[PDB]
Amino acid sequence: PEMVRGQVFDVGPRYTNLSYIGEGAYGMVCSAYDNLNKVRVAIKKISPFEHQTYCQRTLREIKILLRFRHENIIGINDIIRAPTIEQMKDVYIVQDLMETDLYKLLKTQHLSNDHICYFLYQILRGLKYIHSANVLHRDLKPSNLLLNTTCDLKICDFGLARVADPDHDHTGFLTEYVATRWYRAPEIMLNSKGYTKSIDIWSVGCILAEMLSNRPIFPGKHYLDQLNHILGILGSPSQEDLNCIINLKARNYLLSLPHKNKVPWNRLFPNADSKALDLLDKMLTFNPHKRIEVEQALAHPYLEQYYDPSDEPIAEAPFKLPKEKLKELIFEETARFQ
Ligand SMILES: COCCN1CCc2c(cc(-c3ccnc(Nc4ccnn4C)n3)n2C)C1=O
Structure with missing residues (x-):
């Protein structure tokens, strides 16, 4: 032993x-x-x-x-x-x-755009399969993305994974969550249990941002602070965004906040590929219903070199004490x- x-x-x-x-x-x-x-x-x-x-x-x-x-x-x-x-x-x-993970990698290595593009493609490729199986990973982060010397990527750690349950996603303001804070979608803090596919897309956007700068984009120090960071970059949610938030405590909290302007992606990432910033914007959309879907992300101009629907397989058998x-x-x- x-x-x-x-x-x-x-x-x-x-x-x-x-x-x-x-x-x-x-x-x-x-x-x-x-x-x-x-x-x-x-x-x-x-x-x-x-x-x-x-x-x-x-x-x-x-x-x-x-x-x-x-x-x-x-x-x-x-x-x-x-x-x-x-x-x-x-x-x-x-x-x-696998030789390493993305978290370890980002700590000491600057990524080329080619690397960022390929890594992102593989994440979305894997994610397409997961979501096609009606499953939500729910804990996507750099430490859960494994890499090898040839830059092959694999998603790991399905401990918090669940079958998607869109119709049972609503919850109250500030409902306790289990997944890694820095990667939680804004809706988790406001009215979501994280039972929809859009939750994974937000996490991917955060990873993309982290690949661009080698620093987490929304490094919240605690529960509500996380929402602050997100709003600090995204700016105040639009009236439209707010109409989807019908639980009053969450709606009134947002309304209580001073108006904040959106920090432009190109100011946060001055060296970033413009197509990458465009997709980043679509992944990190405040309204989860407007957030880009995985298949849409794969068809995005930023990933044109790798996109191939025939070579992006889906699950044969999705999931229905x-x-x-x-x-x-x-x-x-x-x-x-x-
Ligand atoms: C108890 O934790 C449960 C969640 N959890 C996180 C830690 C973890 C898991 C799978 C691997 C793994 C699998 C295959 N290869 C590697 N390689 C590798 C990575 C970094 N450094 N290295 C050498 N890591 N790791 C490091 C995993 O599922």
């Missing part, structure tokens, strides 16, 4: 010679050699069983990735677990190993790999 950073990984004997990669709230990721396929891989140790929420997230993630098969989406090579429900304390997800019972469902989903 090899140990990484005081954490025991029961992945032997197929997987030997382990190296640490990253640490999650209820899971850890390492690299390891695969003696059966003769290559290093990534292994995710998930220990969710002590909490129901963590158990919910694990089941959904496993279910989705086991259904999904796409070049721009991390798949599951294998799942390791104890032979019995009683002896199962942790679940191990084996995945292809106490902690203990969830453990049982996790057990069953993983039985195939025993």
Whole structure:
């Protein structure tokens, strides 16, 4: 039982010679050699069983990735677990190993426009597939985008993913959210549960902006501060934008704010490709109903060199409890790999 950073990984004997990669709230990721396929891989140790929420997230993630098969989406090579429900304390997800992630990359490397264009294309390509499956990733960020030496990109971390539920998206002002603050759409703070595809598009716009400058565009220090940052660049929402906000506390808060002017994209990104700024504007639209859709984004002039509808596949089969019972469902989903 090899140990990484005081954490025991029961992945032997197929997987030997382990190296640490990253640490999650209820899971850890390492690299390891695969003696059966003769290559290093990534292994995710998930220990969710002590909490129901963590158990919910694990089941959904496993279910989705086991259904999904796409070049721009991390798949599951294998799942390791104890032979019995009683002896199962942790679940191990084996995945292809990627050299790095976008978060790591942006910290020290300036991206060329060619790189920005290709990365963005691959994100949207993957996202087209996800959304075609009626699924929402709900946690897109640079750290969840893996890269390799040839600039191939794969979306990872489907823990907060859900089936789209447009008709059950409304909620009140300042309703608590789980996904990464800096990438939350303005509507989350005002009237949305984040059950619509537009939520993912906002996140992609934020990533694009971050690719352009190597700095997060809306770095909120707390819940409402996030909305402030967004308004600080987008400016005051139009009357039209406001008519879609019918819950009064959210509507009256916006109306209470002093008029703010829109900061021009070209002032924020003086070196940016103009077509890139045009698409950025469309992704970062305050009104989620006016926000560009994934397929629309792919057909945008900025991505003309890579756009090919025939080569941007969609899902063949879209998606239509106490902690203990969830453990049982996790057990069953993983039985195939025993
Ligand atoms: C417990 O966390 C759950 C959420 N979560 C975030 C951390 C993570 C996941 C998958 C990988 C992974 C997968 C494949 N290759 C890589 N490579 C890689 C990336 C950076 N550096 N490196 C070497 N990372 N990482 C690093 C993942 O699903």
